[PDB]
């Protein structure tokens, strides 16, 4: 059994098992500041961030044919100075080595145009902040699951609580072939969530780097934070125990 | 670092870290059948059982103050003959070590009239499949967090996928206070999740007994299923 | 499959999970006493107690002859307040649910005679201070495998420590058969291992209870405590990650 | 908590999250052989083989001062075609990060001379077949606790079990600051075991990679396999 684990509870200026790439920083309290955010702490506009573990994950084998499962939970914060207008969102994501990053706004650093492609070989959850009708987004703030795609494969409503901190817990479970992303926001109790099968094995080589990445605006005043606190993952590769997981790490 | 933990694949005939009440049996095929079913798979009306964890669970602690976190996640799967009659629902539970079976129906087994009462100690995760009026349940079948009460302090729809297998997590951040509970179909890729801010230090005891309770409807015809298929269940409690 | 698991970092005054047969007691200060101590500190002759997980382990399956793997490891201090004048031990034991407390003295609450029984179906590891040659006991304090016989199947020298704390590690390999047993005190900084190939399948039944038993001298002044500070078991029967539980405990 | 964390039960082929150094293979078979071996199974003398996680580990921190717990497990097998001809044995270590291989032979690729050196910042416990009177080592085969030099600071002796499977546990306790080498061999039931007090966070920097460094003899027939079947790690420092 193949597997692969970290916990950050925190980040740190000096973050070696971290590839940062595009504008993404970590600032001297912790944050990974994923897009740029001037030093009175506003975002700034037509900004583009990734950061990635410096590990390769071994997410599916072809010898054996079998599929990896993995669970990451993560915390982060969203703030716009001007909540009327906000771009462009994070994601969470899988992409081969040595992905690198892809357009910026709406295409949220993992792609490069409106249409599918079997080449990107990524699949992400998307947090997404602005519709951009181009890719069929849906008209309110919304999770979605990206396969090689940024016209998500499926979406649903997500408040955006400004400011605030949301949990998320994302799994996908090799047997059911089921993804889900759930998220919390302990301030307001609300709670979003989503679930559907897709293939990892069809879209994703063996092996995978994992992180972060987002966009601002390309439209000063469409501006908004995205920072991240703190990441948990694993995976594994068979041939997971999770309430041991979200409990532990 | 007090902690406590268990993993159940599936269920034994023979068991003794499972304590059963009422209705309550593990079948030949390690199904945990918290209501009575009859020889050709036929749910029977008037049921109530009850599994909880043979072990006491350390909850909180009242000479540091600090609380338990905890985690729990089970696949579940309930059936009715004619899903226009169905009631009334399982919950998952913590609750004293001791706590016996209460009131079957829309009480679920936990509680034993509609009013709030400090007295219970009970919290419950309920999924709820039959509007009691009088406990002032939602027009649609529906998750429910419940504390020393059958009204929920909160709810959310849940649409039932008759017969399909229910995935479960409850979450229980005690920094937070934050309890959570979500549930998916992975047959029907449908999700459904609540979330709120519950003071166990208030409600529950040092120690529990954590399980499941189930009931069948009064009036017969409102019957369905309650099988569990598996089970596991963390707790760490900080010193 | 089949799991479970606890951690003990203290003993806390109310314990439901943990049944105290005997002269066990769980101080103020969190000790779980196995063995009789006055007020002042003093070990006190003619004493035997046992402390075990109040929920039955399912270690073995007939349906599926699969045994279980394990793992457990605690922290535990003896005291003697004549060095030279020292008895009987403790060990760590599985046992059927319910078993009670057989003979105190150098069977260590274990055994009734010197003889095998099958009927015993208990396997210890045992921390043996007191030449029993009756029961082919070694001339030095040891760690001994005990499978249904008082009689080790298998030994290594232990110098004990006086009043130091010594940290235990147990491990069970269903693949292997392979019974590890290991002791060790940080402050004097020695070492002590042993490992043998012992049967569970047909030594156990499939569900034990686990804990803790243990003896003082049946001759006064032969006299030592027997203190545990703290206590984690795991255990894991298929249809363990050994390193991450030793990081947890 | 910053955590980190890896199994391996097999190597593969095509291994990106471990960079290997100098003559190290991992086979078809899914073995990783530090150390040169023909089609024929023959160990190769003048060999020097590393192999570590691609990833670094924190294994102390600075600002807070603390320093990481630690354990890590492994299986690994060494045959020689001779046994009354062996050299030199094999380690785990933790290291800088980019670390290079060093001198081979009895050094291990870890040192370059019978020198200590605070500048190597190279914690390792060795598996040592050949005594190299030159660096203090004992009239036996051992185990050896090597901080900053291949002069242990402690050994114990370590009956080599040729061409048998050996299963490791090396654990470290940044509270009591106990360095713990286990190594057991399944087949033969032997048992050895070494512990130390060792300072970490005066030893290394803030920042590791981890892994085996392997050798074989730099004279003629003085050779034995260095093979490595299985790996996993856990280091845990906190915040
Ligand atoms: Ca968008
Ligand atoms: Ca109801
Ligand atoms: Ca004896
Ligand atoms: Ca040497
Ligand atoms: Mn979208
Ligand atoms: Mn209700
Ligand atoms: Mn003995
Ligand atoms: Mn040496």
Do not use: C, M
Not at 97 to 125: E, H, I, M, R, W
């Amino acid at each position: 059994t193949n597997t692969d684990s970290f916990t950050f509870s925190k980040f740190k200026p000096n973050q070696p098992n971290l590839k940062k790439q595009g504008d993404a920083t970590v600032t001297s309290s912790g944050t990974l500041q994923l897009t740029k955010v001037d030093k009175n702490g506003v975002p700034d506009p037509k900004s583009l961030g990734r950061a990635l573990y410096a590990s390769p994950i071994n997410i599916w084998d072809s010898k054996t044919g079998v599929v990896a499962s993995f669970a990451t939970s993560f915390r982060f914060t969203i703030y716009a100075p001007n909540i009327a207008t906000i771009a462009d969102g994070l994601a969470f994501f899988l992409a081969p080595v040595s992905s690198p990053p892809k357009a910026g706004a709406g295409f949220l650093g993992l792609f490069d145009s409106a249409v599918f492609n079997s080449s990107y070989q990524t699949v992400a959850v998307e947090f997404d902040t602005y519709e951009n009708t181009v890719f069929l987004d849906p008209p309110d703030t919304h999770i979605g699951i990206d396969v090689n795609s940024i016209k998500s494969i499926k979406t649903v409503k997500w408040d955006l609580a400004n400011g605030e901190a949301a949990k998320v817990l994302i799994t996908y479970d090799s047997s059911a072939k089921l993804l889900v992303a759930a998220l919390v926001y302990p301030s307001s109790k609300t709670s979003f969530i989503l679930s559907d099968v897709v293939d990892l094995k069809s879209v994703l080589p063996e092996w995978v780097s994992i992180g972060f990445s987002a966009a601002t605006g390309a439209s000063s005043g469409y501006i908004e934070t995205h920072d991240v606190f703190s990441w948990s993952f694993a995976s594994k590769l068979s041939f997971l125990d999770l309430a041991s997981f979200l409990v532990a790490n």
